[PDB]
Design a protein around this ligand. Structure first.
Ligand SMILES: Cc1cn([C@H]2C[C@H](O)[C@@H](COP(=O)(O)OP(=O)(O)[C@H](Cl)P(=O)(O)O)O2)c(=O)[nH]c1=O
Ligand SMILES: [Cl-]
Ligand SMILES: [Cl-]
Ligand SMILES: [Mg+2]
Ligand code: NA
Ligand code: NA
Length: 326
DNA sequence: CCGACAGCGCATCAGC
DNA sequence: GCTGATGCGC
DNA sequence: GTCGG
């Protein structure tokens, strides 16, 4: 990409803040500046040029100047020399291994991919699966494969009940050419806001996708969220597709637009939009938008008939999913 | 000069 | 086993 | 680490 060196540097700094420092706001800060720079259709030539962009303040500006001048950041080279941090940075790339498990592993002398394989009895189920598919889960999903997965999922939910609705969200719905996982929003006029004629709806759908061997593994399961692993069928004589992460969310119908807003993101967009909602006197979660009182108590859920209605309350112009790629 | 920084679902662990 | 906190991931 | 107040 055009400013790929700068956004790589910021992402590496961000990974350090998340994985090692656990400095969440510094993580998001590096991450926000990385987002707006990758989006800027111009070759950044100095830190001052970048300091014109939102999210880029003094210290990211200075780090841009250092990186432009040298190809490097001393901070990053020092982190890369730190064995504990670097081991932690690697181990947190396994799905299910965060900073706590990472440094637990490192103190146990477990710090490599093959260390993990030798001590698999030390991993919980999520971590075992993350290790099993580690190479797979480093691979992104071409949009063309996302279309095939979408075809399978949307038809299968119709097979369980023809009035299920399934919307593939996340980066795919913002039009990305590749995606990290598959995010499937699901609902049914049976299910309205927690007035349940009887649940088990998500399990029914998961059952069916397991039955056709699309879902191959389970990471988490509740009444509203399933996390697991799935795989496209291969044709005879031919290399398997990589296994893929999948998240399916079952949401009440009267909450569909909040659900699809949230599940479409991006995460930075969601954080920004939700912050502006607080500034305007509302709170937005995946289910509802509510008013806030002076003392902060949330009101009752507001009517929503579209994504645009949510933008209207907080006095934003509607943004197509493709322009929410923050 | 400093405090805010989104909001949630599910799994597991520590202590009882 | 439960509560409540922590961990990890959308 | 940035931003807004
Ligand atoms: C991680 C995260 C996600 N979301 C919402 C917004 C997200 O859009 C939605 C999907 O989460 P995802 O992790 O799959 O994000 P994505 O956009 O699909 C990624 Cl670019 P990729 O999967 O293609 O690699 O969940 C949040 O609201 N807060 C969050 O902290
Ligand atoms: Cl570097
Ligand atoms: Cl709610
Ligand atoms: Mg996704
Ligand atoms: Na991970
Ligand atoms: Na996801």
């Amino acid at each position: 990409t055009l400013n790929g060196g700068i956004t790589d540097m910021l992402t590496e700094l961000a990974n350090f803040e998340k994985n090692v420092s656990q400095a969440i706001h510094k993580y998001n800060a590096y991450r926000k500046a990385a987002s707006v720079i990758a989006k800027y259709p111009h070759k950044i030539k100095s830190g001052a040029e970048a300091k014109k962009l939102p999210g880029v303040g003094t210290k990211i500006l200075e780090k841009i100047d250092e990186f432009l001048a040298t190809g490097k950041l001393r901070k990053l080279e020092k982190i890369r020399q730190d064995d504990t941090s670097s081991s932690i940075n690697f181990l947190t790339r396994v799905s299910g291994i965060g900073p706590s498990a990472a440094r637990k592993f490192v103190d146990e002398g477990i710090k490599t991919l093959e260390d993990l394989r030798k001590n698999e009895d030390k991993l919980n189920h999520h971590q075992r699966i993350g290790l099993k598919y580690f190479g797979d889960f480093e691979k992104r999903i071409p949009r063309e494969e996302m279309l095939q997965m979408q075809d399978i999922v949307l038809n299968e939910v119709k097979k369980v009940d023809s009035e299920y609705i399934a919307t593939v969200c996340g980066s795919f719905r913002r039009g990305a050419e590749s995606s990290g996982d598959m995010d499937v929003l699901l609902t049914h006029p049976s299910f309205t806001s927690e007035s349940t004629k009887q649940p088990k709806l998500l399990h029914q759908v998961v059952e069916q996708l397991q039955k056709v061997h699309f879902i191959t593994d389970t990471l988490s399961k509740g009444e509203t969220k399933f996390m697991g692993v799935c795989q496209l069928p291969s044709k005879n004589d031919e290399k398997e597709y990589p296994h893929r992460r999948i998240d399916i969310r079952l949401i009440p119908k009267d909450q569909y637009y909040c659900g699809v807003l949230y599940f479409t993101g991006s995460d930075i967009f969601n954080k920004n939009m939700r912050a502006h909602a607080l500034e305007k006197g509302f709170t937005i979660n995946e289910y509802t938008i509510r008013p806030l009182g002076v003392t902060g108590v949330a009101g009752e859920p507001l009517p929503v008939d579209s994504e645009k209605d949510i933008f209207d309350y907080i006095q934003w112009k509607y943004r197509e999913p493709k322009d929410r790629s923050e």
